[PDB]
């Protein structure tokens, strides 16, 4: 059939809620392999479009895969109010990696939509 343009890592700006953002991130004890384990239904994370099955690739625009599990979490915690979490479905990542285009922000920063917040 026809497949759409699968190359759209979603940038989720997570707001500092009560004492964090409201998700549980699980990481494999190496470097690359940080995935969301569980999301709090009462978090700013879930409304940002962050799902309990996504992988975190970049924080605010810079890649955090080659960090440590601690450092990855620290990246998000280092944000006072808002932090831009770039997340993608691990299933979709398989397709995306094969494209390897500048989807990092070049694609993400498409046309502007003035109106809603």
């Amino acid at each position: 059939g026809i497949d759409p343009f699968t190359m759209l890592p979603r940038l989720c700006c997570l707001e500092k809620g009560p004492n964090g953002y409201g998700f549980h991130l699980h990481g494999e004890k190496g470097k690359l392999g940080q995935y969301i384990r569980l999301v709090e239904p009462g978090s700013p994370a879930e409304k940002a479009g962050l799902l309990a099955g996504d992988r975190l690739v970049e924080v605010n625009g810079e890649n955090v895969e080659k960090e440590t599990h601690q450092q990855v979490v620290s990246r998000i915690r280092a944000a006072l109010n808002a932090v831009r979490l770039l997340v993608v479905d691990p299933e979709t990542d398989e397709q995306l990696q094969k494209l390897g285009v500048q989807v990092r922000e070049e694609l993400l920063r498409a046309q502007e939509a003035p109106g809603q917040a």
Binding site: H24, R37, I76
Partner: peptide
């Protein structure tokens, strides 16, 4: 036990 943010 995962990591809470």
């Amino acid at each position: 036990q995962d990591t809470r943010l």
